[PDB]
Amino acid sequence: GAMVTAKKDENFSEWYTQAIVRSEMIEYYDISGCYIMRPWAFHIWEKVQRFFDDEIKKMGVENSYFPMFVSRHKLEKEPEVAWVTHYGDSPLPEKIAIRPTSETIMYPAYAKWIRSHRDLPLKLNQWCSVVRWEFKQPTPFLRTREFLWQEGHTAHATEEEAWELVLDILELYRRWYEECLAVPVIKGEKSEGEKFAGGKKTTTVEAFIPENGRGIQAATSHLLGTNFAKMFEIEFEDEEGHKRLVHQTSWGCTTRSLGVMIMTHGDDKGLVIPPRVASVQVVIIPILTGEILGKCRELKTMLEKADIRVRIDDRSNYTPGWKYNHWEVKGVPLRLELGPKDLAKGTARVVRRDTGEAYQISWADLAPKLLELMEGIQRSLFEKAKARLHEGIEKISTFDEVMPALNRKHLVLAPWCEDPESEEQIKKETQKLSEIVMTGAMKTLCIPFDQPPMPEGTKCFYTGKPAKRWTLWGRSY
Amino acid sequence: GAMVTAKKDENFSEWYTQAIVRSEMIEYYDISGCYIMRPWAFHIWEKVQRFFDDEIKKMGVENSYFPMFVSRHKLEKEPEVAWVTHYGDSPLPEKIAIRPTSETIMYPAYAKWIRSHRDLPLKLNQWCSVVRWEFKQPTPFLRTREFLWQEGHTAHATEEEAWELVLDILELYRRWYEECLAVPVIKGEKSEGEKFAGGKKTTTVEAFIPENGRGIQAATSHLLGTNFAKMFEIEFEDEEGHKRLVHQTSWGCTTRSLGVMIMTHGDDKGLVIPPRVASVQVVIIPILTGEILGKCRELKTMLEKADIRVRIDDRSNYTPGWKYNHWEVKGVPLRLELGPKDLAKGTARVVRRDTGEAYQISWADLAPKLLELMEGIQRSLFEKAKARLHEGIEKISTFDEVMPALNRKHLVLAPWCEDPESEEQIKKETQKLSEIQAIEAGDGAMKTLCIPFDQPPMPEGTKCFYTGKPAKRWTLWGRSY
Ligand SMILES: Cc1cc(N2CC[C@](C#N)(C3(C)CC3)C2=O)cc(C(=O)NCc2cc(F)cc(-c3cnn(C)c3)c2)n1
Ligand SMILES: Cc1cc(N2CC[C@](C#N)(C3(C)CC3)C2=O)cc(C(=O)NCc2cc(F)cc(-c3cnn(C)c3)c2)n1
Ligand code: PRO
Ligand code: PRO
């Protein structure tokens, strides 16, 4: 048999490795930092990809594909980049490099395509792989040297429109995590030191892993503004003849979501998959003759008439207990058992994956009851995570409250004056205090949109200067 | 005013570039061999990809994604590969390679995954890009140094099942080209020298460009057989305990398809895009003031209720004829003109892209008539291309018939004994003659395309059209891409 023996609330690392390995999600590779995405993990990426694609196509964004290579001189305009130097056995003219981001590849094309305001807005997106090479230790799904992602780049006439689309894409990411993956995220504004290089303002959705008390950036949505139009000479004309700079936005989302989705919902038994991204929503396990096996196909067709995803585990050379454990660690939401007594009884027995609750349902009520079951499972999966999230955040006043809260594996919400030097000072002294496999330092995660009230007079929690906004702090990824 | 000045049947080389550039399908990148696929071609790639994906999901094939790099030792296991050596300024402990094809990447994992007969069959597929860095003349879509594709790799317990899957995948490719792209292909078997390296037998579909009389391999499906399992120790335990080798198949299809489609259908005006893959099936062009745009949007919604892809070109800054030409070079099959005189009569004037025939349809009859018209356009495009294909293939007996046919921009179906030395000699001999021909012109070899599945009868005996040996089968020959 193949199941999970590690406990999630003890050795979280080994539990994560077991849950993602013993569920046929990843496979190791001989090249460090890279992993093989098996179909069970990929059919979730497919669902979130199709959803986000439909949504951005409703916004008018069109898909495209730009090369994976970039000339050296077009990238030298403002590391962890990999370069190509040979073709078989001979050297090339210029050493071309692999894309860590397609701004320097697409924007030369944007300047050529954009001439008049009638060419705006230009909204492009592409689904591609991206290489980011670091010495540091790799972690599956979260810190991968080569990850799949979507990256969209838009160019608008005015900054108002650009900012509006930035926020719309951030809302799309919020739905991606909260509605599709049932992982609660916090919308926020990035720090000046934590924001995208060369951009004006960077928006983000942040997630929280309670087991290690670490924050992690789910997705990102940037307002580049005109800072990149200067770098790449992307200009247009209004109906007055005046050459003006375009306002650019860029945004992206990786397979890191999947990893987050796992840590938020897996338990000591393995995976739990929200019914909205589950490749197989209901698995039918026949228990043994032709009558039972043929009735299972009738029930499969019936549930497929309700757009439910059903696979019958008619595999004969496998004990039913092995199928139980197999699909338990797989994370399938509802498992459906049908034996001979069930077929005679005219009912079936389903066991939900989140709580283990058993249900006896008649065949005439099977489809709507399973719909209600999946909806309730998704809602509860999201609510438990929301509760853990808000119990993992502490509202503080001074810095003397920081180190206890960090030790409780929590985050802090503090009044901050946004002095960029103060953030580095705070990181340094939090690391120093933690010193007494990753750092113990505390940095900014975001400046949440849902801003709590700032009282009449107020004070920064570190420098004592007048505080500007509430900031989320914590040990991060 | 992006038009197409070139003539397709005169300067075809330039016509292709004009048709693909002034439709805003491709854009040029500073690195040779790499091209930017703008949305107008990518929304065709999207449709063919959704089609093939649904169809292979019916076959139990599940999608995945393997890394884009391969180790040196695992790749050199028995070229045109791009090798990564540095990160920033520092070199690497081992040099890695960018994938030309992911056999050496997936198959080490196959060896780990297959243990018993219960793990078989195993059907994987991935949609990604591959980098073949040939340093010859790059052609958009046709021969690029970086191109998108799907590659599917399967492993079975017996070879009959593997070959069955091979032929099913090849049929899926024939549907991809003839039912989606409306481009006729020929199913066939690759020669012993042109088959996939290390494989047992390669099946293929071939397409024909008449303007330069060239054959081009549309897609491919390989029977690797037992050969790769020997390389990567991919074995399983039989139902009886005997340890045996898997039988593997590998198949793939690239963006080249799109390219071929263009060459098959575009005319002197620009693109012609088959309606089953077109991003905009019907373009509504207001003749230019809300009285007209309102009815345009009403018709847009009504046609959308019939799953018709409609975009209304309400850009008031251009003349209607400019819009006509702009959506003609893009190859939109149907153009719906709605003038102010049309609003009182309650009709609209629809013009199709392939023939130019113009119809005037009532608003109520709009949806079913446009459905019928798109079906007819698809049928007529494919049937015209199929007739052109059968006009361009010459059935021959002697090598004396070869050079005439090749000079007519044609292919030859000839009885062949299938000895590989014979193929190489015919290649060299056709080149050594086409060059002597072109000497007196102020400025060409022929190779095997496929051994078609629909073999004509082979009379008793019959001599190979080049060597005089007893002929095996009718092979396709022509100048290749
Ligand atoms: C899956 C994924 C997604 C990402 N991004 C980047 C873009 C983004 C999106 N979208 C955001 C901007 C974050 C939202 C995303 O998810 C970034 C990375 C990444 O740095 N991988 C390189 C790498 C390899 C490795 F072996 C180890 C490390 C490492 C780092 N610190 N330590 C201690 C080890 C890092 N890996
Ligand atoms: C788009 C694409 C698809 C392919 N495959 C991959 C799979 C396949 C499909 N489908 C099949 C093998 C046909 C089944 C296909 O077409 C192969 C290639 C390719 O060799 N590109 C490298 C290249 C660059 C270049 F600048 C020039 C040349 C060149 C070659 N001869 N001359 C005179 C110039 C070649 N380019
Ligand atoms: O990688 C990043 O962080 C940004 C967002 C997508 C494109 N560049
Ligand atoms: O590259 C090729 O020719 C084959 C097609 C599938 C993968 N390998």
Residue numbers in the entry:
A (entry chain B): 331 to 408, 417 to 626, 632 to 779, 790 to 830
B (entry chain A): 331 to 408, 417 to 626, 632 to 786, 793 to 830
Article sentences:
Aminoacyl-tRNA synthetases (aaRSs) are an essential enzyme family for protein translation and, in several cases, have been validated drug targets. Among the aaRSs, prolyl-tRNA synthetase (PRS) is a validated drug target in Plasmodial spp and Toxoplasma gondii (Tg). In the current study, we examined five ATP-mimetics L95, L96, L97, L35, and L36, based on the 1-(pyridin-4-yl) pyrrolidin-2-one (PPL) scaffold.
Structurally, the stacking of 4-(3-Fluorophenyl)-1-methylpyrazole moiety allows rotameric conformational changes in Glu472, Lys474, and Arg481, wherein Arg481 is stabilized by the H-bonds in L95/L96/L97/L35 complexes but not in L36. The stereoisomeric configuration of cyano- and cyclopropyl groups in L36, in contrast to L35, creates torsion at ~90° in the oxo-pyrrolidine and methyl-pyridine groups. Regardless, the 6-methylpyridine core is stacked between the phenyl ring of Phe485 and the guanidinium moiety of Arg594. Whereas the significant ~90° bent in oxo-pyrrolidine exposes its hydrophobic core to the active site, displacing the oxo-pyrrolidine keto O atom away from Thr592 and surrounding water molecules. Interestingly, the stereoisomeric distortions in L36 result in a slight lateral shift in the neighboring L-pro, preventing its OXT atom from forming a fourth H-bond with NE2 of His560. This absence of the fourth H-bond may lead to loose packing in the active site. While the possibility of off-site targeting by ATP-mimetics cannot be dismissed, genetic selection data shown here provide evidence these compounds target only PRS. These ATP mimetics and their stereoisomers (e.g., L35 and L36), while occupying the same catalytic pocket, exhibit specific and distinct inhibition profiles.
